[PDB]
Amino acid sequence: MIWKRKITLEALNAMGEGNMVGFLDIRFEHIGDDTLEATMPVDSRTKQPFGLLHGGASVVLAESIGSVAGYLCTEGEQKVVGLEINANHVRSAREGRVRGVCKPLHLGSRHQVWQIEIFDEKGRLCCSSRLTTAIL
Amino acid sequence: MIWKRKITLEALNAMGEGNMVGFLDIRFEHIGDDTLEATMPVDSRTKQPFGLLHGGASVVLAESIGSVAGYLCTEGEQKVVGLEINANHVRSAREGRVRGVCKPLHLGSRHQVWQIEIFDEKGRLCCSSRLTTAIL
Ligand SMILES: CC(C)(COP(=O)(O)OP(=O)(O)OC[C@H]1O[C@@H](n2cnc3c(N)ncnc32)[C@H](O)[C@@H]1OP(=O)(O)O)[C@@H](O)C(=O)NCCC(=O)NCCSCC(=O)c1ccc(O)cc1O
Ligand SMILES: CC(C)(COP(=O)(O)OP(=O)(O)OC[C@H]1O[C@@H](n2cnc3c(N)ncnc32)[C@H](O)[C@@H]1OP(=O)(O)O)[C@@H](O)C(=O)NCCC(=O)NCCSCC(=O)c1ccc(O)cc1O
Numbered sequence A, B: 001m002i003w004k005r006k007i008t009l010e011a012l013n014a015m016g017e018g019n020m021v022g023f024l025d026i027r028f029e030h031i032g033d034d035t036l037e038a039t040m041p042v043d044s045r046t047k048q049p050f051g052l053l054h055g056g057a058s059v060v061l062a063e064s065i066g067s068v069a070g071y072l073c074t075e076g077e078q079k080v081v082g083l084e085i086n087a088n089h090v091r092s093a094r095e096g097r098v099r100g101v102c103k104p105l106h107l108g109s110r111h112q113v114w115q116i117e118i119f120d121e122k123g124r125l126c127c128s129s130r131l132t133t134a135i136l
Helices: A009-014 A055-072 B009-014 B055-072
Strands: A027-031 A036-041 A080-089 A097-107 A111-119 A125-135 B027-031 B036-041 B080-089 B097-107 B111-119 B125-135
Touching: A009 A027, A036 A055, A055 A080, A055 A097, A055 A111, A055 A125, A055 B055, A055 B080, A080 B055, A097 A125, B009 B027, B036 B055, B055 B080, B055 B097, B055 B111, B055 B125, B097 B125
Parallel strands: none
Antiparallel strands: A027 A036, A036 A097, A080 A125, A080 B080, A097 A111, A111 A125, B027 B036, B036 B097, B080 B125, B097 B111, B111 B125
16 A cells, blocks of 8 residues: 555544535545545535536645645655646536545655546546645 | 626626635635736635645636636637646645736637736735636
8 A cells, every 4th residue: 555644534534624625525435555535516615607616626626635645645744735736627517526536646755746537426537637745 | 908798896706606706705806907816715615634725725716717817808608618727836825815816828719828826915926827728
């Protein structure tokens, strides 16, 4: 496994309480040996004014999963912050929940790179994102 | 003057009601002849679990300003969607509100490129972002 920090799904989900992760109902649903997965609803909290999932909301999901994945790949008092984030909005979503799957592209001593793909309920790719973190 | 749609600040702010823009108290504060400005709080709705402004929240602001600027540079039943987004998190924001300033880099027939810079209350740059839209 890639993780250096051991965490339960419960404890991972508790991290979001009282911050943006909790406010957007972002829910971590699976911790794999080398992947992390979370879902997020498409509703008033995350839509843009024309009824689509807000592009920014997709990026919130991507940066949330990638950043905490990165954090879990550090140890002790190391911190991880997002340094650069990018995404392509390949398909819109209008309802239900979307699901982001995060995998590592680079796990360095000082930086990491994470790939997050976000799918709708039909397994259709909606957002492809890449996140670069800095380890502090 | 780049705009093709005439809109008041009040009507522009009205667009965000019932969606993520209003939820996060993103407020448009100035419409220039070639710039658009909106602010966003740094609080429990937009922070990450360690107290910083969530990287994705910065992108929510960038996409919210850039996409509607894009829309305001089209006419009639034309639609604008975010296609590609990138953002550099160069300084953390921790309190108050951040201020996003959006300027056009390219205004095309079927695509636009928008630059959004987001500053903290002390005027320091915190996020530098580029949004590419498609006109439908
Ligand atoms: C349009 C693309 C960007 C490019 O692919 P392509 O080759 O150019 O075109 P495709 O052939 O692949 O067609 C794809 C689908 O598009 C539909 N459509 C076509 N024509 C029209 C039309 N005239 N009218 C309507 N729809 C049309 C088609 O029916 C088609 O459906 P299907 O055939 O599949 O049934 C596509 O990748 C896409 O939609 N990505 C998601 C974009 C996204 O959700 N971004 C994030 C959200 S927007 C930013 C935001 O958050 C934001 C924030 C605040 C704010 O104030 C405002 C804000 O905007
Ligand atoms: C520290 C950098 C990463 C590199 O800086 P650089 O290349 O050297 O550039 P500068 O030389 O200009 O330095 C600038 C200022 O920074 C200070 N500074 C330097 N070193 C340290 C340090 N070790 N500690 C503290 N401060 C440090 C410097 O002293 C200087 O301060 P001043 O004295 O001038 O007042 C900086 O670019 C940065 O903080 N970007 C924002 C990151 C961010 O907020 N991302 C988004 C949020 S995190 C991701 C997320 O959303 C997320 C979501 C869910 C989740 O579960 C978890 C999540 O994490």
